[PDB]
Amino acid sequence: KVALHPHDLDERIPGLADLHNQTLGDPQITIVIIDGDPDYTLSCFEGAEVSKVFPYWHEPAEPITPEDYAAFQSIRDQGLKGKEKEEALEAVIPDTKDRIVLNDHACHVTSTIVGQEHSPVFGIAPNCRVINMPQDAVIRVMSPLNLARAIDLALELGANIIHCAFCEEILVQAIKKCQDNNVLIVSPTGNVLPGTLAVGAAKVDGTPCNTKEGILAPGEEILGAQPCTEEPVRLTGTSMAAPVMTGISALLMSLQVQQGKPVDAEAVRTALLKTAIPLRGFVNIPGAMKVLFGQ
């Protein structure tokens, strides 16, 4: 009845309003986002506990001009597809388009998780601690070696949740170390490991746009930030559903802290998966709250 903190996805995600009534996150919960380089000048990140840690083993990349970002956004807003989209990107931003895809993705994903209330993008968990670990410098990104190194560093930075927008034996063992150290890994199914929460995209009506340890969440028309403008945009894809689950998972962990319970990543992951309404099903916050908190 009364959403104390009205959120865009309240109607599409039962129990989100009620969960928001109880927490908007806790700064003791750290989320490390392994993605591109987000734009922290956006007002949705003002007052947010956000910081960038660039992996020390990357060569820093030259900053991308606002004009290049605007070119990419114009091409999206015209709704160009297929061969014509690619010919348009190649015509105007051939050297920078691949980095921009990553950086733009990072703005959107970070805004979905931690965007401040009453800004243009209100995130799921605006009071959690968020560290961005940009990877765009490596584009000259799906490399398993580099992701393993990035995951090891994210663990050392104190991650409770690692959001990997890109998730070889070395990577498999880095994921395993996260599980052994009670750190949740969240990644999209795409458009493979225990203790990973794999996320698929649901349409606006809740149907689907991996199956054993996956969950579906809203992935269509998700409101988020884009670089160099205060104007938000709605995007669609499995990598749009993943950040919704990262935020939800962070809220549930935040509630464990607020109730004086130890952070328990595996309890949160298994509660989500076992209560999902037929991957394993659509996210079911009311069921998860019952399993975790007796609500």
Side-chain angles (χ1 to χ4, degrees), residues 1-203 205-295:
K1 182 99 156 217
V2 162
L4 296 173
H5 305 277
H7 186 280
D8 186 69
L9 289 177
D10 279 347
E11 292 165 306
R12 292 162 72 180
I13 309 183
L16 183 54
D18 176 83
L19 174 54
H20 274 159
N21 291 351
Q22 299 180 64
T23 180
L24 295 178
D26 195 278
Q28 285 166 82
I29 307 298
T30 301
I31 306 171
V32 179
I33 300 176
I34 304 175
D35 202 329
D37 182 12
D39 180 1
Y40 282 2
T41 66
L42 291 181
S43 81
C44 69
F45 303 122
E46 200 144 66
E49 189 167 353
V50 298
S51 57
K52 301 180 185 195
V53 174
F54 293 88
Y56 53 89
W57 64 90
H58 291 164
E59 213 64 23
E62 291 285 279
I64 296 173
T65 58
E67 289 86 358
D68 279 11
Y69 282 118
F72 176 94
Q73 294 160 16
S74 167
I75 284 167
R76 179 159 64 194
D77 293 346
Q78 291 165 54
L80 298 190
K81 298 171 194 313
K83 281 242 178 67
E84 195 182 356
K85 181 184 171 201
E86 300 299 344
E87 288 165 44
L89 289 165
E90 187 68 18
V92 64
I93 47 157
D95 298 337
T96 56
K97 66 184 197 276
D98 294 325
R99 288 172 61 202
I100 291 163
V101 164
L102 268 72
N103 292 352
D104 174 90
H105 191 265
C107 288
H108 201 279
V109 156
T110 309
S111 72
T112 292
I113 294 164
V114 82
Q116 295 298 283
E117 202 182 353
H118 313 118
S119 82
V121 181
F122 171 30
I124 302 283
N127 206 35
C128 283
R129 180 171 178 244
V130 171
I131 302 180
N132 285 94
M133 183 178 304
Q135 305 296 314
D136 76 302
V138 81
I139 299 163
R140 45 196 61 254
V141 72
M142 289 283 290
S143 171
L145 176 56
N146 205 100
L147 178 56
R149 299 177 76 172
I151 290 174
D152 281 331
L153 179 58
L155 277 175
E156 179 61 17
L157 297 163
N160 295 104
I161 301 179
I162 292 167
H163 183 88
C164 192
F166 318 128
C167 274
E168 161 63 7
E169 299 153 45
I170 198 178
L171 177 56
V172 164
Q173 82 161 336
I175 302 323
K176 189 65 191 177
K177 191 168 193 167
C178 292
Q179 197 190 343
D180 290 351
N181 289 121
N182 195 64
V183 174
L184 181 59
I185 295 194
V186 182
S187 71
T189 60
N191 339 253
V192 177
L193 297 173
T196 289
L197 180 74
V199 188
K203 298 173 60 43
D205 59 20
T207 67
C209 300
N210 305 301
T211 78
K212 299 218 290 162
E213 279 155 8
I215 192 173
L216 291 160
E220 184 172 20
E221 299 285 312
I222 304 297
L223 189 69
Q226 58 189 330
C228 305
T229 174
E230 285 295 321
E231 187 80 3
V233 64
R234 292 196 180 263
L235 295 177
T236 300
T238 57
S239 73
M240 306 297 106
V244 169
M245 294 309 309
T246 290
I248 290 164
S249 298
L251 289 177
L252 293 169
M253 292 185 173
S254 293
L255 206 47
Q256 291 172 328
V257 169
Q258 281 170 216
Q259 297 193 353
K261 299 174 167 181
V263 172
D264 194 338
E266 190 66 359
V268 165
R269 188 181 77 100
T270 55
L272 289 164
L273 288 174
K274 74 143 153 287
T275 63
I277 298 155
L279 307 180
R280 292 284 285 283
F282 189 80
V283 60
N284 179 13
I285 295 179
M289 295 287 284
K290 196 171 178 144
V291 167
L292 292 171
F293 307 112
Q295 290 191 16

Coordinates of all heavy atoms in Angstrom, one line a residue, residues 87-169:
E87 N 27.5 0.1 -39.3 CA 28.1 1.1 -40.3 C 28.1 2.5 -39.8 O 29.0 3.3 -40.1 CB 27.4 1.0 -41.6 CG 27.6 -0.3 -42.4 CD 26.6 -0.5 -43.6 OE1 26.3 0.5 -44.3 OE2 26.1 -1.6 -43.7
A88 N 27.1 2.9 -39.0 CA 27.0 4.2 -38.4 C 28.1 4.4 -37.3 O 28.7 5.4 -37.2 CB 25.6 4.4 -37.9
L89 N 28.3 3.3 -36.4 CA 29.3 3.4 -35.3 C 30.7 3.5 -35.9 O 31.5 4.3 -35.5 CB 29.2 2.2 -34.4 CG 27.9 2.1 -33.5 CD1 27.8 0.7 -32.9 CD2 28.1 3.1 -32.3
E90 N 30.9 2.6 -36.9 CA 32.2 2.6 -37.6 C 32.5 3.9 -38.4 O 33.6 4.3 -38.4 CB 32.2 1.4 -38.6 CG 33.6 1.2 -39.3 CD 34.6 0.7 -38.3 OE1 34.3 0.2 -37.2 OE2 35.8 0.8 -38.7
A91 N 31.4 4.6 -38.9 CA 31.6 5.8 -39.6 C 32.1 7.0 -38.7 O 32.9 7.8 -39.2 CB 30.4 6.2 -40.4
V92 N 31.7 7.0 -37.5 CA 31.9 8.2 -36.6 C 32.8 7.9 -35.4 O 33.6 8.8 -35.0 CB 30.6 8.9 -36.2 CG1 29.7 7.9 -35.3 CG2 30.9 10.2 -35.4
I93 N 32.7 6.8 -34.7 CA 33.5 6.4 -33.6 C 34.1 5.0 -33.7 O 33.9 4.2 -32.9 CB 32.7 6.5 -32.3 CG1 31.3 5.8 -32.4 CG2 32.5 7.9 -31.8 CD1 30.7 5.4 -31.1
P94 N 35.0 4.9 -34.8 CA 35.6 3.6 -35.0 C 36.6 3.1 -34.0 O 36.7 2.0 -33.7 CB 36.2 3.7 -36.4 CG 36.5 5.2 -36.5 CD 35.3 5.8 -35.8
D95 N 37.3 4.1 -33.4 CA 38.4 3.8 -32.5 C 37.9 3.6 -31.0 O 38.6 2.9 -30.2 CB 39.5 4.9 -32.5 CG 40.2 5.0 -33.8 OD1 40.1 4.1 -34.6 OD2 40.7 6.1 -34.1
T96 N 36.7 4.2 -30.8 CA 36.3 4.2 -29.4 C 34.9 3.5 -29.1 O 34.6 3.3 -28.0 CB 36.2 5.7 -28.9 OG1 35.3 6.4 -29.8 CG2 37.6 6.4 -28.9
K97 N 34.2 3.0 -30.1 CA 32.9 2.3 -29.9 C 32.9 1.1 -28.9 O 32.0 1.0 -28.2 CB 32.3 1.9 -31.3 CG 33.1 0.8 -32.0 CD 32.4 0.5 -33.4 CE 32.8 -0.8 -34.0 NZ 34.1 -0.6 -34.7
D98 N 34.0 0.3 -29.0 CA 34.0 -0.9 -28.1 C 34.2 -0.5 -26.6 O 33.5 -1.0 -25.7 CB 35.1 -1.9 -28.5 CG 34.8 -2.5 -29.9 OD1 33.6 -2.8 -30.2 OD2 35.8 -2.7 -30.7
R99 N 35.1 0.5 -26.3 CA 35.2 1.0 -25.0 C 33.9 1.7 -24.5 O 33.5 1.5 -23.4 CB 36.4 2.0 -24.9 CG 37.7 1.3 -24.9 CD 38.8 2.3 -25.0 NE 38.8 3.2 -23.8 CZ 39.3 4.4 -23.8 NH1 39.9 5.0 -24.8 NH2 39.2 5.1 -22.6
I100 N 33.3 2.4 -25.4 CA 32.0 3.1 -25.1 C 30.9 2.2 -24.7 O 30.2 2.4 -23.7 CB 31.6 4.1 -26.2 CG1 32.5 5.3 -26.3 CG2 30.1 4.6 -25.9 CD1 32.4 6.0 -27.6
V101 N 30.8 1.1 -25.5 CA 29.8 0.0 -25.1 C 30.0 -0.4 -23.6 O 29.0 -0.5 -22.8 CB 29.9 -1.2 -26.0 CG1 29.2 -2.5 -25.4 CG2 29.3 -1.0 -27.4
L102 N 31.2 -0.6 -23.2 CA 31.6 -1.0 -21.8 C 31.3 0.1 -20.8 O 30.8 -0.2 -19.8 CB 33.0 -1.5 -21.7 CG 33.2 -3.0 -21.9 CD1 33.1 -3.5 -23.3 CD2 34.6 -3.4 -21.3
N103 N 31.7 1.3 -21.1 CA 31.6 2.4 -20.2 C 30.1 2.8 -20.0 O 29.7 3.1 -18.9 CB 32.4 3.6 -20.7 CG 33.9 3.3 -20.6 OD1 34.3 2.3 -20.0 ND2 34.7 4.2 -21.1
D104 N 29.4 2.8 -21.1 CA 28.0 3.1 -21.1 C 27.3 2.0 -20.2 O 26.5 2.4 -19.4 CB 27.4 3.1 -22.5 CG 25.9 3.3 -22.5 OD1 25.5 4.4 -22.6 OD2 25.2 2.3 -22.6
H105 N 27.6 0.7 -20.5 CA 27.0 -0.4 -19.7 C 27.3 -0.2 -18.2 O 26.4 -0.3 -17.4 CB 27.7 -1.7 -20.2 CG 27.0 -2.9 -19.6 ND1 27.5 -3.6 -18.5 CD2 25.9 -3.6 -20.1 CE1 26.7 -4.6 -18.3 NE2 25.7 -4.7 -19.2
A106 N 28.5 0.2 -17.9 CA 28.9 0.5 -16.5 C 28.1 1.6 -15.8 O 27.8 1.4 -14.6 CB 30.4 0.8 -16.4
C107 N 27.9 2.7 -16.5 CA 27.0 3.8 -16.0 C 25.7 3.3 -15.6 O 25.2 3.5 -14.5 CB 26.8 4.9 -17.0 SG 28.2 5.9 -17.3
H108 N 25.1 2.5 -16.6 CA 23.7 2.0 -16.4 C 23.6 1.0 -15.3 O 22.8 1.2 -14.4 CB 23.3 1.4 -17.7 CG 21.8 1.2 -17.9 ND1 21.1 0.2 -17.3 CD2 20.9 2.0 -18.6 CE1 19.8 0.4 -17.6 NE2 19.7 1.5 -18.4
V109 N 24.5 0.0 -15.3 CA 24.6 -1.0 -14.2 C 24.9 -0.4 -12.8 O 24.2 -0.7 -11.9 CB 25.6 -2.0 -14.6 CG1 26.2 -2.8 -13.4 CG2 25.1 -3.0 -15.7
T110 N 25.8 0.5 -12.7 CA 26.1 1.1 -11.4 C 25.0 2.0 -10.9 O 24.6 1.9 -9.7 CB 27.4 2.0 -11.5 OG1 28.5 1.2 -12.0 CG2 27.8 2.4 -10.1
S111 N 24.3 2.7 -11.8 CA 23.2 3.5 -11.5 C 22.0 2.7 -11.0 O 21.3 3.0 -10.1 CB 22.7 4.4 -12.6 OG 22.1 3.7 -13.7
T112 N 21.8 1.5 -11.7 CA 20.7 0.5 -11.2 C 20.9 0.0 -9.8 O 19.9 -0.3 -9.1 CB 20.7 -0.7 -12.2 OG1 20.3 -0.3 -13.5 CG2 19.7 -1.7 -11.6
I113 N 22.2 -0.1 -9.4 CA 22.5 -0.7 -8.1 C 22.5 0.4 -7.0 O 21.9 0.2 -6.0 CB 23.9 -1.4 -8.1 CG1 23.8 -2.6 -9.0 CG2 24.3 -1.8 -6.7 CD1 25.2 -3.2 -9.4
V114 N 23.1 1.5 -7.3 CA 23.4 2.5 -6.2 C 22.9 3.9 -6.5 O 23.3 4.8 -5.7 CB 24.9 2.5 -5.9 CG1 25.7 3.4 -6.9 CG2 25.1 3.0 -4.5
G115 N 22.2 4.2 -7.5 CA 21.7 5.5 -7.8 C 20.9 6.1 -6.7 O 20.1 5.3 -6.0
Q116 N 21.1 7.3 -6.4 CA 20.5 7.9 -5.1 C 19.0 8.2 -5.3 O 18.6 8.6 -6.5 CB 21.3 9.2 -4.7 CG 22.8 8.9 -4.4 CD 22.9 7.9 -3.2 OE1 22.7 8.4 -2.0 NE2 23.1 6.6 -3.4
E117 N 18.3 8.1 -4.3 CA 16.8 8.4 -4.3 C 16.6 9.9 -4.7 O 17.4 10.7 -4.3 CB 16.1 8.1 -3.0 CG 14.6 7.9 -3.2 CD 13.8 7.6 -2.0 OE1 14.4 7.5 -0.9 OE2 12.6 7.6 -2.1
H118 N 15.6 10.2 -5.5 CA 15.3 11.5 -6.0 C 16.2 12.1 -7.0 O 16.1 13.3 -7.3 CB 15.1 12.5 -4.8 CG 14.3 12.0 -3.6 ND1 14.8 11.8 -2.4 CD2 12.9 11.6 -3.6 CE1 13.8 11.3 -1.6 NE2 12.7 11.2 -2.4
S119 N 17.1 11.3 -7.5 CA 18.0 11.7 -8.6 C 17.3 11.1 -9.8 O 16.2 10.5 -9.7 CB 19.4 11.1 -8.5 OG 19.4 9.7 -8.9
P120 N 17.8 11.3 -11.0 CA 17.1 10.8 -12.2 C 17.1 9.2 -12.2 O 16.2 8.6 -12.8 CB 18.0 11.3 -13.4 CG 18.6 12.5 -12.9 CD 18.9 12.3 -11.4
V121 N 18.0 8.6 -11.5 CA 18.0 7.1 -11.4 C 18.1 6.7 -9.9 O 19.2 6.9 -9.3 CB 19.2 6.4 -12.1 CG1 19.1 4.9 -12.0 CG2 19.1 6.8 -13.6
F122 N 17.1 6.1 -9.4 CA 17.0 5.6 -8.0 C 17.4 4.1 -8.1 O 16.6 3.3 -8.7 CB 15.6 5.8 -7.5 CG 15.4 5.2 -6.1 CD1 16.4 4.9 -5.2 CD2 14.0 4.9 -5.8 CE1 16.1 4.3 -4.0 CE2 13.7 4.3 -4.6 CZ 14.7 4.0 -3.7
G123 N 18.5 3.7 -7.5 CA 18.9 2.3 -7.6 C 18.2 1.4 -6.5 O 17.5 1.9 -5.7
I124 N 18.5 0.1 -6.6 CA 18.0 -0.8 -5.7 C 18.6 -0.7 -4.3 O 17.9 -0.7 -3.3 CB 18.2 -2.3 -6.2 CG1 17.5 -2.5 -7.6 CG2 17.7 -3.3 -5.2 CD1 16.0 -2.6 -7.5
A125 N 19.9 -0.4 -4.2 CA 20.7 -0.4 -2.9 C 21.5 0.8 -2.8 O 22.7 0.7 -2.6 CB 21.5 -1.7 -2.8
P126 N 20.9 2.0 -2.7 CA 21.7 3.3 -2.7 C 22.6 3.5 -1.5 O 23.5 4.4 -1.6 CB 20.6 4.4 -2.8 CG 19.4 3.7 -2.2 CD 19.5 2.3 -2.7
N127 N 22.4 2.8 -0.4 CA 23.2 3.0 0.8 C 24.3 2.0 1.0 O 25.0 2.0 2.0 CB 22.4 3.0 2.1 CG 23.0 3.8 3.2 OD1 23.7 4.9 3.0 ND2 22.8 3.3 4.4
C128 N 24.5 1.1 0.0 CA 25.6 0.2 0.0 C 26.9 0.8 -0.5 O 26.9 1.9 -1.1 CB 25.3 -1.1 -0.8 SG 24.2 -2.3 0.0
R129 N 28.0 0.2 -0.1 CA 29.3 0.7 -0.6 C 29.6 0.0 -1.9 O 29.5 -1.2 -2.0 CB 30.4 0.3 0.4 CG 31.7 0.8 0.1 CD 32.7 0.6 1.2 NE 34.1 0.9 0.9 CZ 35.1 0.1 0.9 NH1 35.0 -1.2 1.1 NH2 36.3 0.6 0.6
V130 N 29.9 0.8 -2.9 CA 30.2 0.3 -4.2 C 31.6 0.8 -4.7 O 32.0 1.9 -4.6 CB 29.1 0.9 -5.2 CG1 29.5 0.5 -6.6 CG2 27.8 0.3 -4.8
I131 N 32.3 -0.2 -5.2 CA 33.6 0.0 -5.8 C 33.5 -0.4 -7.3 O 33.2 -1.6 -7.6 CB 34.7 -0.8 -5.1 CG1 34.8 -0.4 -3.7 CG2 36.1 -0.5 -5.8 CD1 35.9 -1.1 -2.9
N132 N 33.8 0.5 -8.2 CA 33.9 0.1 -9.6 C 35.4 -0.2 -9.9 O 36.3 0.5 -9.5 CB 33.4 1.3 -10.5 CG 31.9 1.4 -10.5 OD1 31.4 2.2 -9.8 ND2 31.3 0.7 -11.5
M133 N 35.5 -1.3 -10.7 CA 36.8 -1.7 -11.1 C 36.8 -1.7 -12.6 O 36.5 -2.8 -13.2 CB 37.2 -3.1 -10.5 CG 38.6 -3.6 -10.9 SD 39.0 -5.2 -10.2 CE 38.7 -4.9 -8.4
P134 N 37.1 -0.6 -13.3 CA 36.9 -0.5 -14.7 C 37.9 -1.4 -15.5 O 39.1 -1.5 -15.1 CB 37.2 0.9 -15.0 CG 36.9 1.7 -13.7 CD 37.3 0.7 -12.7
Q135 N 37.5 -2.0 -16.6 CA 38.3 -2.8 -17.4 C 38.5 -2.3 -18.8 O 39.1 -3.0 -19.6 CB 37.6 -4.2 -17.5 CG 37.3 -4.8 -16.1 CD 38.5 -5.2 -15.4 OE1 39.5 -5.7 -15.9 NE2 38.5 -4.8 -14.1
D136 N 37.9 -1.2 -19.1 CA 37.9 -0.7 -20.5 C 39.3 -0.4 -21.1 O 39.6 -0.5 -22.3 CB 37.0 0.6 -20.7 CG 37.7 1.9 -20.1 OD1 38.0 1.9 -18.9 OD2 37.9 2.8 -20.9
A137 N 40.3 -0.1 -20.2 CA 41.7 0.1 -20.6 C 42.3 -1.2 -21.3 O 43.1 -1.0 -22.1 CB 42.6 0.4 -19.4
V138 N 41.8 -2.4 -21.0 CA 42.2 -3.6 -21.6 C 41.8 -3.7 -23.1 O 42.3 -4.6 -23.8 CB 41.7 -4.9 -20.9 CG1 40.3 -5.2 -21.2 CG2 42.6 -6.0 -21.2
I139 N 40.8 -3.0 -23.5 CA 40.3 -3.0 -24.9 C 41.2 -2.2 -25.8 O 41.4 -1.0 -25.6 CB 38.8 -2.5 -25.0 CG1 37.9 -3.4 -24.2 CG2 38.4 -2.5 -26.5 CD1 36.6 -2.8 -23.9
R140 N 41.9 -2.9 -26.7 CA 42.9 -2.2 -27.6 C 43.1 -3.1 -28.9 O 42.1 -3.3 -29.7 CB 44.2 -2.1 -26.9 CG 44.6 -3.3 -26.1 CD 45.8 -3.0 -25.1 NE 45.4 -2.0 -24.1 CZ 45.8 -0.7 -24.0 NH1 46.6 -0.2 -24.9 NH2 45.3 0.1 -23.0
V141 N 38.4 -8.2 -23.5 CA 38.0 -7.9 -22.1 C 37.4 -9.2 -21.5 O 37.4 -9.3 -20.2 CB 36.9 -6.8 -22.0 CG1 35.6 -7.3 -22.6 CG2 36.7 -6.3 -20.6
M142 N 37.0 -10.1 -22.3 CA 36.4 -11.4 -21.8 C 37.5 -12.4 -21.3 O 37.2 -13.4 -20.8 CB 35.6 -12.1 -23.0 CG 34.3 -11.3 -23.3 SD 33.0 -11.7 -22.0 CE 32.6 -13.4 -22.3
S143 N 38.8 -12.0 -21.5 CA 40.0 -12.7 -21.1 C 39.8 -13.3 -19.7 O 39.6 -12.6 -18.7 CB 41.2 -11.8 -21.1 OG 42.3 -12.4 -20.5
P144 N 39.9 -14.7 -19.5 CA 39.7 -15.3 -18.2 C 40.8 -15.0 -17.2 O 40.6 -14.9 -16.0 CB 39.8 -16.8 -18.6 CG 39.7 -16.9 -20.1 CD 40.3 -15.6 -20.6
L145 N 42.1 -14.8 -17.7 CA 43.2 -14.4 -16.9 C 42.9 -13.1 -16.3 O 43.1 -12.9 -15.0 CB 44.4 -14.3 -17.8 CG 45.7 -13.8 -17.2 CD1 46.1 -14.6 -15.9 CD2 46.9 -13.8 -18.2
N146 N 42.5 -12.1 -17.1 CA 42.3 -10.8 -16.5 C 41.1 -10.7 -15.6 O 41.2 -10.0 -14.6 CB 42.1 -9.7 -17.6 CG 42.5 -8.3 -17.0 OD1 43.5 -7.8 -17.3 ND2 41.6 -7.7 -16.2
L147 N 40.1 -11.5 -15.9 CA 39.0 -11.5 -14.9 C 39.4 -12.2 -13.6 O 39.1 -11.7 -12.6 CB 37.7 -12.2 -15.5 CG 36.6 -12.3 -14.6 CD1 36.1 -11.0 -14.0 CD2 35.4 -13.0 -15.3
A148 N 40.2 -13.3 -13.7 CA 40.7 -13.9 -12.4 C 41.5 -12.9 -11.6 O 41.3 -12.9 -10.4 CB 41.6 -15.2 -12.8
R149 N 42.4 -12.2 -12.2 CA 43.2 -11.2 -11.5 C 42.3 -10.1 -10.9 O 42.5 -9.7 -9.7 CB 44.2 -10.5 -12.4 CG 45.2 -11.5 -13.0 CD 46.1 -10.8 -14.0 NE 47.1 -10.0 -13.3 CZ 48.1 -9.4 -13.8 NH1 48.4 -9.4 -15.1 NH2 49.0 -8.7 -13.1
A150 N 41.3 -9.7 -11.6 CA 40.3 -8.7 -11.2 C 39.5 -9.2 -10.0 O 39.3 -8.5 -9.0 CB 39.4 -8.2 -12.3
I151 N 39.1 -10.4 -10.1 CA 38.3 -11.1 -9.0 C 39.2 -11.2 -7.7 O 38.7 -10.9 -6.6 CB 37.8 -12.5 -9.3 CG1 36.7 -12.3 -10.3 CG2 37.4 -13.3 -8.1 CD1 36.1 -13.6 -10.9
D152 N 40.5 -11.6 -7.8 CA 41.4 -11.7 -6.7 C 41.5 -10.3 -6.0 O 41.5 -10.3 -4.8 CB 42.8 -12.2 -7.1 CG 42.8 -13.7 -7.3 OD1 42.1 -14.4 -6.7 OD2 43.7 -14.2 -8.1
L153 N 41.7 -9.3 -6.8 CA 41.8 -7.9 -6.3 C 40.5 -7.5 -5.6 O 40.5 -6.9 -4.5 CB 42.2 -6.9 -7.3 CG 42.3 -5.5 -6.8 CD1 43.4 -5.3 -5.7 CD2 42.6 -4.6 -8.1
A154 N 39.4 -7.9 -6.2 CA 38.0 -7.5 -5.6 C 37.9 -8.1 -4.2 O 37.3 -7.5 -3.3 CB 36.9 -7.9 -6.5
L155 N 38.3 -9.4 -4.1 CA 38.3 -10.0 -2.8 C 39.2 -9.3 -1.7 O 38.8 -9.2 -0.6 CB 38.8 -11.5 -2.9 CG 37.8 -12.5 -3.3 CD1 38.5 -13.8 -3.5 CD2 36.6 -12.7 -2.3
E156 N 40.4 -8.9 -2.1 CA 41.3 -8.2 -1.3 C 40.7 -6.8 -0.9 O 40.9 -6.4 0.2 CB 42.6 -8.0 -2.0 CG 43.7 -7.3 -1.3 CD 44.1 -7.9 0.0 OE1 43.9 -9.1 0.3 OE2 44.8 -7.1 0.8
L157 N 40.0 -6.2 -1.8 CA 39.3 -4.9 -1.5 C 38.1 -5.1 -0.5 O 37.5 -4.1 -0.1 CB 38.8 -4.2 -2.7 CG 40.0 -3.7 -3.7 CD1 39.4 -3.4 -5.1 CD2 40.8 -2.6 -3.1
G158 N 37.8 -6.3 -0.1 CA 36.7 -6.5 0.9 C 35.3 -6.7 0.3 O 34.3 -6.6 1.0
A159 N 35.2 -7.0 -1.0 CA 33.9 -7.4 -1.6 C 33.1 -8.4 -0.8 O 33.6 -9.4 -0.3 CB 34.2 -7.9 -3.0
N160 N 31.8 -8.0 -0.6 CA 30.8 -9.0 -0.2 C 30.1 -9.6 -1.4 O 29.7 -10.8 -1.4 CB 29.8 -8.3 0.7 CG 30.4 -7.8 2.0 OD1 30.6 -6.6 2.2 ND2 30.7 -8.8 3.0
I161 N 29.9 -8.8 -2.4 CA 29.3 -9.2 -3.7 C 30.2 -8.7 -4.8 O 30.7 -7.6 -4.7 CB 27.9 -8.6 -3.9 CG1 27.0 -9.0 -2.8 CG2 27.3 -9.0 -5.2 CD1 25.6 -8.4 -3.0
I162 N 30.5 -9.6 -5.7 CA 31.2 -9.2 -7.0 C 30.2 -9.3 -8.1 O 29.6 -10.4 -8.4 CB 32.4 -10.1 -7.2 CG1 33.5 -9.9 -6.1 CG2 33.0 -9.9 -8.6 CD1 34.6 -11.0 -6.2
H163 N 30.0 -8.2 -8.8 CA 29.2 -8.1 -10.0 C 30.0 -8.2 -11.2 O 30.8 -7.3 -11.5 CB 28.3 -6.9 -10.0 CG 27.4 -6.8 -11.1 ND1 26.1 -7.4 -11.1 CD2 27.6 -6.3 -12.4 CE1 25.6 -7.2 -12.3 NE2 26.4 -6.6 -13.1
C164 N 30.0 -9.3 -11.9 CA 30.8 -9.5 -13.1 C 30.0 -9.5 -14.3 O 29.2 -10.5 -14.7 CB 31.7 -10.7 -12.9 SG 33.0 -10.8 -14.2
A165 N 30.0 -8.4 -15.1 CA 29.3 -8.3 -16.3 C 29.8 -9.2 -17.5 O 29.3 -9.1 -18.6 CB 29.2 -6.8 -16.7
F166 N 30.9 -9.9 -17.2 CA 31.6 -10.7 -18.3 C 31.7 -12.2 -18.0 O 32.1 -13.0 -18.9 CB 33.0 -10.2 -18.6 CG 33.2 -8.7 -18.6 CD1 34.2 -8.1 -17.8 CD2 32.4 -7.9 -19.4 CE1 34.3 -6.7 -17.9 CE2 32.5 -6.5 -19.5 CZ 33.5 -5.9 -18.7
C167 N 31.4 -12.7 -16.8 CA 31.5 -14.1 -16.4 C 30.5 -15.0 -17.1 O 30.8 -16.1 -17.4 CB 31.4 -14.2 -14.8 SG 32.9 -14.0 -13.9
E168 N 38.4 -21.3 -18.6 CA 39.8 -21.4 -18.2 C 39.9 -21.6 -16.7 O 39.2 -21.0 -15.9 CB 40.5 -20.1 -18.6 CG 41.8 -19.8 -17.9 CD 42.8 -20.8 -18.1 OE1 42.7 -21.7 -19.0 OE2 43.9 -20.7 -17.4
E169 N 40.8 -22.5 -16.3 CA 40.9 -23.0 -15.0 C 41.2 -22.0 -13.9 O 40.6 -22.0 -12.8 CB 42.0 -24.1 -15.0 CG 41.7 -25.3 -15.9 CD 43.0 -26.0 -16.4 OE1 43.9 -26.3 -15.6 OE2 43.1 -26.3 -17.7

